Structure 1
């Protein structure tokens, strides 16, 4: 009845746990508006602002984030939230909603589903 995904950027890894909810999006016990780089706030509302709160009506998602910096953590957060929604709609919702959401997200930006293979090199 729940799904568990991960999303990485450089070193930062954000793990997202998604379940039947009431429309709350939570990270590290803090609301998504309550993350300290408010300059980069619209990047982390991109799934919500792109997709609306109507399809986030009955979804409870929690994200716990390890490592990295600040920007890499934010990208890991948005990637993990998006993969959590995609896997939840894979396992518990139909497939047409899956391909519709994936088409919207890919036509917006590529990094929000697939991770950047580049990392810090020796």
Structure 2
């Protein structure tokens, strides 16, 4: 059928349609280290220095990348590429090579599969916020 979960984190999402195609090196369709906010631009250069040029000649990952928030939209591209390699290798040859590159990527950094569960908590009685209380007079 069609198995497609793409990449997402916190709030943002990189829809990663994985199929055969050109599959050039592009982030938001843009060059290697060229992103306008200019903050976390190295995170993708690392793996492609190990395998070689032949390996990305047939992996087209068409990404709809939407979402404001750096720690969301960044750190979701790493999740997306991890899942892209995982699915490609699992479906094509065997899960041992997927085992290997997933091993290096995930044991390399824990925080792809795990997102921050922290979120703004509820405001309560008699206070300006969640924990603070109004000044008590005597």
Question: 1:38–1:54: structure 2 CA closer, same or farther, 3 Å change rule?
Answer: farther
CA offsets, 1:54-97, max 9 Å, x none? 43233222221122313321211221122112112112232211
Contact 2:25–2:32 (CA under 8 A) maintained in structure 1:
yes
CA distance in 1, matches of 2:104, 2:40: 22
- With normalisation by structure 1, the TM-score equals 0.74
Conserved in 2, the CA contact under 8 Å of 1:17 and 1:63? yes
Matches of 2:34 and 2:4, distance apart in 1:
23
Once superposed, which parts of structure 1, at least 4 consecutive aligned residues long, lie more than 6 Å away?
A: none
Distance in 1 (CA, whole Å) between partners of 2:45 and 2:91 is 24
Would the alpha carbon gap of residues 72 and 6 (structure 1) be closer, same or farther in structure 2, given more than 3 Å must change?
A: same
User: Is residue 12–residue 76 contact of structure 1 (8 Å, CA) maintained in 2?
Assistant: yes
**Which is worse superposed, 49-58 or 19-28?**
49-58
Q: Tell me which moved more, 2-11 or 98-107.
A: 2-11
Aligned-residue RMSD, C-alpha: 2.8
Residue 83 to residue 119, structure 1, CA distance change in 2 (3 Å): farther
Structure 1 unaligned blocks of 5 or more: none
Q: TM-score, with normalisation over the residues of structure 2?
A: 0.67
Alignment length, in residue pairs?
121
Ranked by relative contact order (alpha carbons within 8 Å, sequence separation 6 or more), the top structure is 1
Change in CA separation of 1:118 and 1:45 when aligned onto 2, cut-off 3 Å: farther
